[PDB]
């Protein structure tokens, strides 16, 4: 029924009460009470049905009941395909363990290897990890995981689609299996999905379907917009768009919560009143922001694309995809139709760099109409000089710019469709110009003959 | 004495203690 | 461990054709004695 009906710890229930959730959703009711019992769960929900709270509550309660301390090491590992949902579960896990003494951490690709190694040896108890970096840490770094009692694999169908078949099959063979609860979630059920279940789950699972089988993936009733914009005037076109299309409803999709945070602070200094929605905020502030936006006449909202997948988009005049979308299939179909928005005339556009026009070929393959907008060069508001004076002088904006720039490049590297979103076709000097930098800050863009006389290994404890 | 050495003596000097039987 | 068939198998690949049928004694000059010693 509700969260109070479950007999949870008063430390946990106070955290849920401050978050605002009083009514449990469909997956939360049908998965948590068998998960607290100890039975393994196989879920088939889409993101935004509340599944992030559905596995964190048993993991938090397990850690609180067993009285976990930092010296014990990891108790629960949550596997997440890309770093953006890893940082989304991190904010939810931060709100859950506000009262507890157990520790919580994030391992992600495109992050510092050595800082994560110091974090892991110091002792995290709940760890949200991308599969590639988790296998690197499990194989090389010294940290305690002998007391692992819970394993969660979130959005499995994306994990195999991204290309972690070999890695995830090695992950379940190095983690301990006895006295462990394994919960698996995936929106679609493909052939590779059940082979992950037979190697990770126990012989008796519990099968839960709260899926939306009425997928209204429109094929023809859509019209996509796009604007070809150079890499060094992407923000200036966003600013000129938002300034002139004020007194209207605007929703902007970024790729990273750090870039949402930086653009929120910059637009307040640049004097444009814009609403924001990122993971460094309270969960209560998150809901009061969107309720204010859904009832407002005009306004403009910044959120990441993974935030909108869990959220109910209201009637809006524009949907603008500034950063590249996380999965292009879900953008064109779902977000194109929600931009159309039942009755009112709502138009969707996407920012494209000149090196990104193979998206047009992919759009032409699926046969979906396009219109490109002209945007004359006079109407660009050149506030580049004001922006660079702010970044070079304000210290807090410099940190936010550096983190937003790196998270933008790091999300670009870990993109699924690498044919059109390639980081080696990105001029990094120009993309740091848009963020407000004259010198692009350093980021690692990457994050025949065998031996003569040699034979394959047959023995020896080579570690 | 050096400034680093004086800083450590200011904030962590030798204490005065005893051990009971 | 003494794999027998694989041991003679490796002997074939480095076996010289030492035989008084064609090869004289000056080639090898290897003598195997009858006494076990």
């Amino acid at each position: 029924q509700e969260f109070s009906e479950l007999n949870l710890s008063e430390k946990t229930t106070k955290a849920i009460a401050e978050m605002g959730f009083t009514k449990m959703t469909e997956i939360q009711r049908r998965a948590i009470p068998p998960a607290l019992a100890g039975k393994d769960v196989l879920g088939a929900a889409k993101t935004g049905s509340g599944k992030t709270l559905a596995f964190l509550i048993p993991a938090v309660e397990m850690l609180s009941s067993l009285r976990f301390k930092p010296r014990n090491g990891t108790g629960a590992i949550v596997v997440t395909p890309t770093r953006e949902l890893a940082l989304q579960i991190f904010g939810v896990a931060r709100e859950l363990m506000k009262y507890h003494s157990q520790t919580y951490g994030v391992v992600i690709g495109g992050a510092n290897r050595r800082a994560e190694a110091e974090k892991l040896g110091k002792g995290v108890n709940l760890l949200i990890a991308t599969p590639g970096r988790l296998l690197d840490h499990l194989q090389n770094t010294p940290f305690v995981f002998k007391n692992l009692k819970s394993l969660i694999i979130d959005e499995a169908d994306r994990i195999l689609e991204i290309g972690f078949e070999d890695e995830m099959r090695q992950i379940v063979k190095i983690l301990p299996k006895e006295d462990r609860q394994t919960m698996l979630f995936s929106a679609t059920q493909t052939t590779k999905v059940e082979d992950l279940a037979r190697i990770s789950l126990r012989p008796g699972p519990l099968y839960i379907n709260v899926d939306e089988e009425k997928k209204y993936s429109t094929v023809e009733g859509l019209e996509q917009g796009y604007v070809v914009v150079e890499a060094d005037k992407r923000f200036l076109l966003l600013f000129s768009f938002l300034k002139k299309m004020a007194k209207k409803k605007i929703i902007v999709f970024f790729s990273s919560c750090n870039s949402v945070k930086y653009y929120s602070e910059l637009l307040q200094y640049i004097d444009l009143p814009v609403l924001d929605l990122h993971g460094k905020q309270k969960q209560q502030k998150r809901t009061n922001t969107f309720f204010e936006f859904c009832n407002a006449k005009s306004g403009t909202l910044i959120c990441t694309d993974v935030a909108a997948r869990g959220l109910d988009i209201p009637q809006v005049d524009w949907i603008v995809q500034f950063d590249p979308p996380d999965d292009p299939r879900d953008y064109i179909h779902r977000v194109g139709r929600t931009a159309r928005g039942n009755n009112g005339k709502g138009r969707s556009l996407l920012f494209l760099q000149p090196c990104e026009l193979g998206f047009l070929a992919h759009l032409k393959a699926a046969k979906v109409p396009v219109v490109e907008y002209d945007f004359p060069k006079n109407k660009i508001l050149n506030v580049q000089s004001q922006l660079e004076k702010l970044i070079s002088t304000n210290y807090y904006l410099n940190q936010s710019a550096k983190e937003g720039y790196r998270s933008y490049i790091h999300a670009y590297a870990s993109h699924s469709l690498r044919s059109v979103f390639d980081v080696h076709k990105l001029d990094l000097v120009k993309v740091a110009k848009s963020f407000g930098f004259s010198t692009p800050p350093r980021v690692d863009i990457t994050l025949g003959r065998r031996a003569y006389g040699s034979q394959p290994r047959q023995g020896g404890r080579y570690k | 004495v050096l400034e680093k050495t004086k800083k450590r003596l200011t904030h962590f000097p030798q204490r005065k203690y005893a051990v009971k039987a | 461990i003494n794999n027998k068939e694989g041991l003679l198998t490796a002997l074939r690949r480095i076996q010289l054709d030492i035989n008084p049928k064609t090869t004289p004694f000056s080639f090898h000059q290897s003598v195997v004695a009858s006494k076990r010693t």
């Binding site: 067993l66 976990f68 014990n72 304000n394 | 962590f12 009971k20 039987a21 | -």
Partner: protein
């Protein structure tokens, strides 16, 4: 009851106090030394400097209690400090 086999759980009672130690028929010298240890001490509270109070009072006189705007201000907060640092200095000076 030890679920995780911890050899330190039985000997229990990541930041600790760094300067002191929070501690819990006999000879007269030992009883005399215990009165020296447990004797109440002097607080010796540090005070804010006069120019520091003027810097903080100027911030209240403009922004009131909004700590976010005070950190975001540049003329009256030249050495750019976070709102968390300014709030502690305000609470010490009695200006909320």
């Amino acid at each position: 009851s030890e679920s995780d086999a911890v050899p330190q759980q039985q000997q229990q009672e990541n930041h600790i106090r760094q300067h002191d130690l929070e501690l819990e028929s006999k000879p007269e010298v030992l009883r005399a030394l215990e009165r020296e240890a447990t004797r109440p001490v002097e607080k010796t509270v540090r005070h804010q400097s006069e120019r520091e109070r003027e810097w903080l009072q100027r911030l209240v006189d403009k922004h009131g209690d909004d700590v976010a705007a005070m950190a975001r201000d540049r003329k009256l907060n030249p050495y750019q400090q976070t709102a968390s640092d300014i709030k502690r200095r305000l609470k010490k000076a009695g200006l909320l």
